[PDB]
Design a protein around this ligand. Structure first.
Ligand SMILES: O[C@H](c1cc(C(F)(F)F)nc2c(C(F)(F)F)cccc12)[C@@H]1CCCCN1
Ligand SMILES: O[C@H](c1cc(C(F)(F)F)nc2c(C(F)(F)F)cccc12)[C@@H]1CCCCN1
Lengths: 166, 166, 166, 166, 166, 166, 166, 166, 166, 166, 166, 166
């Protein structure tokens, strides 16, 4: 039961990395070039795009992927230098759990579960409130939901192993 | 008879991967930049493109290709860790069959068998119904048909081997 | 006499692959962006480009190159698994001959021997007949002729070897 | 206590390099193409962009990363040629400390801690003072703060080891 | 005297390949996008660009570089299969000489020694004669002269060795 | 004293190559697209850009870097074929010195020490004198000064070693 | 009672003529230049304007004013030539009554009682239905109502006099 | 005292007519052509102009001028036909008083005492509220105030004479 | 019976003159400014407008009106100079009849009975056949029919009087 | 001496009226259409034109001309009704003097003695200060000076006659 | 025979004046606004229009009409002052004949008998020869022919009377 | 001899007035709308037009015509009031002579004898010197020469009469 858990954790991690690396950089390529607002005021598109999308999804996901692999690198560097291992194993498992729960919660609080097609903006230099229009909202919603599901699976598996060792 | 089946399955898989990887990313590059509607309303092109092409073909095909190769990776990781194999062989064959039938059915239900040159749109902020025009419809239809044929071949071969073991 | 034939077949194949891979992808890059028609009708450029160039030359050539190398891959995979060879040699030679004659005939029937600078279009939504103008016709004609010559050489050589074994 | 310090220094360095190399080149790609000023004067955008952003952040960070790794390369080349080592160790540690403090101070003096959305320009050929608008200010502020934090960590660690040897 | 000739021939060949491969593809990138004619007629720019630059310099140089390295590949493939060598050496030297003289003569007859800044065009659909303007003529002239000089050196060296063996 | 000189020469050479290879190709990417002149005459921008920047800095630097590494390649090829060495060492040192002094002098005579923001042009088809505006002048001035400093260091070191052997 | 009726009929007629002659020609001056439709199709504005306003109000009113004054001119010309008068008086009164009732009914059937701000058009070459926008609708509605009121007064007065003579 | 009142009434009336007739038609000529709103929506300018200026000042003033001269025309036509006069004098004086008070009150209720430079509009097809800009507001305010003053003088004089007869 | 004929002829003539003089010059004012063709060719609008409307209706009608009043002017000038009259009366009646029949026939042969909304043009410099769109076709058709009716009435009356004298 | 004064006063008045009436309305016709500011802000041209030219010169001059002729009209109407004259003569002379001095002073205080070619504007919605450019400044300055000279002559003459009667 | 000649001369003169005065000013109104050349050079339209139409037809015709009526005015002024007449009659007849023959010859030499639709221009600043397109050529040709016919009639009549007196 | 001089003076004056009044106002109508300069600087067209044409020809001619008729008006007003005449005759003749010589000299000094097609401008805000292009230069030159000739004739005649009285 604990044998397969490691195999599936490794497979899930590699699957997530591959999905992010091969296709995600090209859904977001035209994010700002196809963003448009109904206005004649210079500079309003810049302010409204910046307010609607402060940090792009793909940047957040790359950062999370890199940060959740640091304890393994630390353990490897330690063992390489060696040339209390069990204490290091315990601590790195604890740290990985904490990091993955923090990142999932932050994703939920930053983005939610959908990307709408319209946005209402009231930032200077825009006069009163203006209406703006988003590029590719459905594909981005699908990507959001898929990433949340994968990260949930990973959280479940790591809690499984944590309780297995105890 | 069962000897050649493995060889042809491997050759078909590699052929499909090569065709998708080398040329497909450059037919779809201008999909939205050359999409145009007969209108003077800001934001109508975005909504109508999003409604006509919710998920691009190339994204779906990359996802399918990656997902149909996961049982092999699991089997490899298991055997590497080992350093009931036959039960694993049976189960992974079953899973591969199921995954490939599901993906073929989903392709048929999402896209059909042709890409038309005109599209009729009635989404806000467009006033009533508008007419829009697609880029490269014939090449995309050819690509659709070719991919369906290859996936059908793969389904047939996997059912062949499933019935061979029994 | 039969000794040099293999050497020249290998050299011709590699030469063709190199020419296609290094330069051909950048002659066709601006094919649709520099295509223009004399009209004020929205959507006419898309329809007329699609009717003039249904499948681009470079796509056809990549497909042909990949498909004419499949019998070798099959033979290699068979011999690797082995770890009636002569029957396989005979059959793969026959298949290669057939495939290369089919592809050369199809090229002639799809494209002919020249690319003209003007095109006359009568597809909806264009009103009556309109005149359109092509990008880089002379270079594309040179490329067409060169590829036909190379494929003819390959056909001759394979028939040579077929008659050598008999 | 001195054992883990080396491991964490190596991990911090690699983390910083990865973050800069994978994502940073694509936040700054549209820096000048989406810079706009409220004016009808030709040449004012060029002068005002040049005055607002004399050296781009990403250029400065690449230069710093390369320059802080030179003492290690020198030590490696020396030891390779050898085929007073401790004196070289002392000197290279001193030099690394000095270089990293200089670069952090220079960053603070060149850029500060935020990127504002508006800029006020009074350079020829602009008539009197004009108002200009920046692209992606929030993401760039986040990047600035993150890089300062990482470099501070590195400074602390190197002072730690310097005082450890004494 | 014959010892150094081989060394310098190899060095000249590698130098030419490096110069062509690293920088030449980016001088010609904007060749047609920055070509402009004084006219209001649709389609005149396409015809006049095609008449002024039938085959681009960089295509011709890549083709020549690849074609002048084929005898070496043939000799290598022959010797590999072997696992009258002197007759092959003689013949391949003769062929290389002929190929390089033909390519140099063709360059002179196709392009000459300079690229002018103005071009006079009288092709349909242009009305009478029109004036057009070229991008980056001085850099292209420098490149032309450099390539002619290198190819002349190579011709001299190969004739040297031909007369050395006799 | 002569021991460290080799180490620092190697380190300086590698540093220069890295700086040129990683960042320099992307400062100059928009050199002509953001060049603008105050005029309504077609073709004036092309002529004035060509007169202001006959050969781009990055082309000159790549050429110099490649040409100053040829004597080493010659020496390596000679020693490989061998499988009067000191005479070759002397001669290649002399040649490297000469080449580096020539390239530094040529840089000074071609470009000077700064890139101004305005340029005054009087070339046909421009009527009388017109005013044009440059992109990113400050960054290009910084790059110029840095490259001059590095090349000066290299000249000093090579003269050092020349006088060391005598 | 019959004495004042003539005075008020003359005053009403002159008032109507003055109102039409002095101001009405300048409300309708920009009728077609400020008519606009939401479309990119050439020729749609012409067809939709023609369908919305077949005959302009001011043309109809001028025609009516001229046609209702013809019996008086006939009577004057007859009396001038004379140099059964009562029969002519009776007949011209009858004719004036008939003409004014016909013109009022026709106005009601052609135009109604209001001018709306939006118009829905489905005429070739417009694709399906389009939305168009009118200039100065409120002023035109006020003018319509005023003219109907005046013509009603005139009808009442002429019936009064008709019944007075009997 | 009653002698001069008639003279000044006649002079005031003629002065008002002259001011309206000679200059007023050319202040309002560009009223709609120089009206502009900050928006990209087709048809918003028409709706907002119509809502801001339902009836133009000059139309109202022409109508008032014509309507306040009708009792005199009636009296003249009566006396001409005659070829109880005092009763007619009394009645026409009463009617003139009433008409002029009504028109002054209506002016105050329709327009007020100033024309502002900005207008806030919320009419379909405009999205939410938009800002629009008026042409020549100061001159129009001056004209408004002048006309109110003149009409007040006329009211005072007519009440004077009414109380004089009693 | 012959008494009223003169009265009605005079009334019809004056009515026709008034209708032409007051309103007709302002229906045709925008005839060429609102004429548009679907094309990108310079000069095609001029040629197609000239071919569709060689002589404008209003010019033809003014010419006809002036030419049908010349015999009266001749008779008046003769009688004024006098200060065989019946022979002059006969001849001028004959001439008026002939002139009016000729002008009516010419109108029918030049214009017909309707003005269509579309026109098909094949004149140089237009490429093949193009489609063009007319301004105000319905109003112009109404005007055509009205003018034909009036001229028919005049013809009938003049034949009446011709047969009356005999 | 007093005899000629009346003749010259009448001639000066008529000359001024003719100059204003025949040419002045066509210098000012394009006053706002050729007014332009260096800005991209919608509505700034309207505000800056309104602030630079609150009341146009030609309006002020027409008003002054009409107002300085009212005492004569009053005197004429009085004498016509008569069908103490000297008291009326005295009073009207006094009033004319006062009116002409007031109008000359007001002209000086409103406009000064020149019209500059540049104007500096700081009114909302313009951001900070902008530069604007005037149409036909020299002709307008000449007109200003001429009108001041004529009005001065008239003032002198009226004071002459005032002191003549005493 | 000589009696009717005067009557017809007077009628022809009045007819010509009426035709020129009522319609001719509105055929030529858009002469330069609808003149267009195929070029991108600023100022070419002005030069080519000026070279194609140095003096407009309508200016020449007005001048001729005014100049051919001067002898009558002279004779009238002489006879009015009188309050050798036959000598004046003779001389003015001679002068009128001469003036009308000169004007007809000049018309033929300036304009010919047709107005073509295309014009070929080679004036600075136009580069080489350009093609331009004329407005309303057919109507202008008709006008030309009509005016020549009328002037010929007048010449014939005046020679008739000259020979009548002798 | 002195009898005809008055007749010809009156005829010349009336001829000049008619030529100026009927046609001259419509040659100059588009003077500034068709004035264009080769530049991208806002405001340069205004400054250069103002510097090229400070006072338009037609304004100068109207002013001169009005000012040369003032002595006659003075003489008429004097004689009307009378209801030393010879002294007035002498003085007005002297004044007319002086005025006409002054105006002719001023014309020569202001305008010269031709209107060129090109103008060279160096006024702020134009950068250095720019080239501008004039509308209708040939017609304006013809008008200039004609007006000079007429004014010369008038000068000659007035000197004739001056010397006749003595
Ligand atoms: O990708 C382009 C390229 C590749 C290659 C190959 F893949 F064969 F090595 N060869 C190139 C050649 C060559 F002549 F075929 F070597 C010329 C120009 C660009 C080449 C260049 C290579 C250098 C870096 C810039 N792109
Ligand atoms: O209205 C313009 C005009 C009018 C008058 C006037 F009202 F005094 F008679 N004078 C004009 C003059 C004149 F020199 F003052 F006579 C010149 C040019 C145009 C004039 C011209 C007159 C002729 C027909 C075209 N408009």
């Amino acid at each position: 039961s604990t044998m397969i858990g490691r195999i599936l954790l490794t497979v899930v991690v590699i699957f997530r990395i591959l999905i992010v690396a091969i296709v995600g950089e090209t859904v977001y390529d035209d994010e700002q070039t196809m963003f448009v607002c109904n206005t004649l005021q210079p500079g309003c598109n810049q302010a409204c795009y910046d307010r609607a999308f402060p940090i792009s999804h793909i940047r957040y996901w790359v950062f999370q992927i890199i940060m959740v692999c640091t304890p393994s690198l630390c353990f490897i560097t330690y063992s390489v230098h060696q040339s209390g291992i069990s204490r290091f194993y315990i601590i790195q498992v604890v740290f990985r759990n904490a990091l993955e729960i923090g990142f999932l919660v932050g994703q939920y609080f930053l983005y939610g579960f959908s990307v709408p097609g319209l946005y209402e903006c009231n930032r200077y230099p825009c006069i009163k409130e203006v209406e703006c229009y988003v590029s590719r909202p459905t594909e981005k919603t699908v990507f959001l939901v898929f990433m949340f599901a994968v990260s949930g699976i990973c959280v479940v598996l790591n809690l499984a192993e944590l309780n297995h060792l105890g």
